[PDB]
Design a protein around this ligand. Sequence first.
Ligand code: A1H1W
Length: 138
Amino acid sequence: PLIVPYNLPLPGGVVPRMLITILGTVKPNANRIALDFQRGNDVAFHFNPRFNENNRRVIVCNTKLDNNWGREERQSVFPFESGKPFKIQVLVEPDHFKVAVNDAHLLQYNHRVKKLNEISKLGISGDIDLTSASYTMI
Ligand SMILES: CO[C@@H]1[C@@H](n2cc(-c3cc(F)c(F)c(F)c3)nn2)[C@@H](O)[C@@H](CO)O[C@H]1C(=O)N(c1cc(Cl)cc(Cl)c1)[C@H]1CCCC[C@@H]1O
């Protein structure tokens, strides 16, 4: 177990077939979670569960380039619950990031940042108890 916020290095960046697993528990009164796949100051992929945006639960995904957020991709399917243990898996594929939560497919996010081998850090933040963050190649 680790204290959030936490940076996981991705040395040499990411590559297709790399599977990143984040295990934790959502805090009881959670408002937000974020994963930030970083290329320097750019965020190639921001994955952001919001537990109370205008009293709805939503997943927001985006990219930050030159310190500016781009066009959001939103999903209403919301597999997290306050207080419960979760597993987020991010599978890097040639054209997208694929996300599964608790072994169920959630979403795809097309690569906007093309330099996968420069996406060299994963920041983990928000209302969680972080158990582990690791990766392997499938
Ligand atoms: C709060 O800002 C968020 C960003 N955001 C979150 C976090 C964060 C930090 C943590 F430490 C953490 F633990 C955590 F879980 C999340 N950091 N940064 C991204 O989450 C971004 C992702 O697009 O959104 C921002 C956003 O809230 N807006 C927005 C604003 C602009 Cl300037 C530009 C666009 Cl494009 C959006 C909203 C505007 C009003 C209509 C809705 C819109 O969604």
